[PDB]
Every structure is written in C-alpha cells, then in structure tokens.
C-alpha cells in the first residue's frame, strides 16, 4: 500500500512538477512563440529596411 | 492498493502524458528556440545588412 502510496505519493508530484512543467514549456511556448513572431515580424521590417535602405543606397 | 495503484497508475499515465505535454511543449518550444535563434539571427543579420546598407548609403 506504501509501495503504491509512496509511488504514488512520487508519481503525482511528479506529475504535478510534470503539469507544471508543461505550464512552464508551454507558457515558454507561447512566450516563445511570442518571441519568434516578434523576431519574426522585427525580421520583416529589419528585411523591409534593408530594402528600403538598399533602395536609398 | 488498488486505489492506490490505480491512483498511482493514473499518476503515472498522467505523468506520461504531463511529461509529453512538455515534451511536445518542449518540442514546440524547442523548435521555437531553433526559430528565434534563426529569425533573430537573420534579424540581426538583416539588422547588420541594414546596418551595412544605412552605412553604405
């Protein structure tokens, strides 16, 4: 019962570390994801300047 | 012991599946990671081109 219990006791934390550390990577996701559509879009108009200043140049 | 194997084993199912919700969240963050270091490396290299064509010009 303490096998289970312990295991247990061990399996759900686990878990709940695991829960959270889905949360985390999600939550680093998502802020990631937040973070390459930013780059993504701070890239596009880096690109468009660089366009822009070739065309200038 | 088997409330508890059974807590224990859908502990252990559920940190299965937590772990793949941050192994697929790793994943996703992971292949995120690999796009902010190539988006933001090209913003920086679009940044350092631009920097070259704002020079240049």
Known sequence: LDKYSEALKDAQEKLEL???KA???EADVASLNRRIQLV???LDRAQERLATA???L
Chains 1, 2 share one sequence.
């Open 23 to 25: 949360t985390d990577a």
């Open 40 to 42: 993504e879009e701070e």
């Open 18 to 20: 695991a829960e959270k």
């Open 54 to 56: 070739l065309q200038k």
